[PDB]
Amino acid sequence: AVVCVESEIRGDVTIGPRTVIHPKARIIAEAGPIVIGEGNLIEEQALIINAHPDNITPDAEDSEPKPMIIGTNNVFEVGCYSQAMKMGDNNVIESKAYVGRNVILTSGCIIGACCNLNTFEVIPENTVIYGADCLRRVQTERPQPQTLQLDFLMKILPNYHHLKKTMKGSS
Amino acid sequence: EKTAVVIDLGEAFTKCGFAGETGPRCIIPSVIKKAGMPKPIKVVQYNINTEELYSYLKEFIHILYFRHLLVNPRDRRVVVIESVLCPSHFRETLTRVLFKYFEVPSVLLAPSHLMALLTLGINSAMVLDCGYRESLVLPIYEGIPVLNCWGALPLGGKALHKELETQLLEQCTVDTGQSLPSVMGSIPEGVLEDIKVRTCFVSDLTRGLKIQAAKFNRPSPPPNVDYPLDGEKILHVLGSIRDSVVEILFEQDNEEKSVATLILDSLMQCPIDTRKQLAENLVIIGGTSMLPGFLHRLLAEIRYLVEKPKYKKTLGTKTFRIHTPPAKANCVAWLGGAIFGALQDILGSRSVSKEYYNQTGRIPDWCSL
């Protein structure tokens, strides 16, 4: 993976292969061990979080001892954060996506612009939300978890592949 | 020559059209939503001022044909289509805008029912008018409207939304975003209406009887048909409530109010030289009533009320037909007036000009000429 010197990580994060983290990739995985996936591209200005501390104060039996995870082809773009997103296969997060706490991001997840993810909501597969229309379950089969949106994600991943080699060569 | 304008009086929608235009043009909600507007301004605003509404009309028509086709209507005529019961002051205020502000060549009032007849172009027919707020059974025998055969049920689409919001305000069987049972008061009317309009399939008569049984002292209301929601709050509850709306749509419970009721009223004013004709003329129309599967509940109630003891003498044994609409959803009067205005250059003389409106400024309805 492209372990960029500018990619600011924090804590024990046993990453995976092909997890090209771009410059200024501020993250945090200390209170929760976030394992990276295979085939993503952590862009600039991101924010990976782990175990929302006592500022919010979870006064509901804080005995978490649970680590975050990632998946394949789930490249998150700039602006968008990552508040412990239990992703999967090809769950791309576009610009300025306000990542929510308990959103088990399944496949075919196209996190649109300025779409604040729903806390404690099981993000099923094959669903792309609309921008202004929050929670729009539009394109139930067009944004299909496999062969349609994941195929488009692997197609967008080609530019990420060329950029992965280019960033590994430019550094 | 040129085309013309084709606009009707719609509380919810007032489309525009040209002369002999084959196919729809553009539908837009009748309310006017402007800049810095918290709530759009309607059209059915009676006993309200005339200058503010006058202005709204000016710029709305302005941008209306702009974003429609950017045409210059100071060149072609207008086909005004009516919807009775509206105050003529309002109608003439529209005319005031038209002529005294925009100065179009000529305008011409017309009935929507005429265009509905023009869909088939026959002489005698029943009128199954089902508008946005009311209905109307004012038959057109020999191509002539039947005057005293009138009536209207003020329980249209708008009141249907009122019924919906009533039922759902009573029970919030949706979740939070855990159920939020009647926590807030305002409703997303667009979402509500999306659920409603996107799920309008009429159910069986027997199912309505089940609803009636549920009114006092129930057999399987689901699989219930009702359209997804939003706002992180979606649900799958009884869609049978819309069938409850269909039941309250026709109330005989010490009310005796229905569409068939007005058909009966017409029959009361009908003379023998109209009865069998209308039995043939089972005209199938209605604007907002685009009710899927309504033939069942409809026909069943028709041939359910035929059996009324006080009406067998009036009816006898009259069978009916299905005068199917070759037109579409509500384009009926729209396109009817479109092709109706096509070669009516002849009737362009009947189209009221601004010329005579200068020295006149008035169009007479049933008044002293």
Next chain:
Amino acid sequence: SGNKVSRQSVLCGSQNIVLNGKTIVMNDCIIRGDLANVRVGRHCVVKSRSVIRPPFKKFSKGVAFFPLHIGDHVFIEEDCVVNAAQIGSYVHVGKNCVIGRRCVLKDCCKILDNTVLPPETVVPPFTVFSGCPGLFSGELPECTQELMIDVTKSYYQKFLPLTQV
């Protein structure tokens, strides 16, 4: 280089950059947009806390989308993520706005505040775009654009002596 000549900020992407006159911006922003060709513009303006980037790769035969084009007497605002923007002169961006992919606008692009553009958001000249997606709300007066832009440039240059860094 007729901008605010002061120690304000830094960025990268010196592929086809340009330091013209009468065009300045504020701090808290980052410039990472060398994914395709570049086209800067003098007499423009921008606020603080922003971000901009080009459309896509454009290295191979599969070229990128409409990445960038700037103009004169333009005025960007705060929190405007200009992603894939090819616009013209006297443009006007708003607060919390963002540019969409393959957006090829023209002169006098009054980009509304808190609005964003969708994919393939090519806009016309002397327009006023808005919406979550790309949607031309209204239009704009060109004379008023150049005039008010110069007036705002002088007024901002007046208070520009603040923060001598």
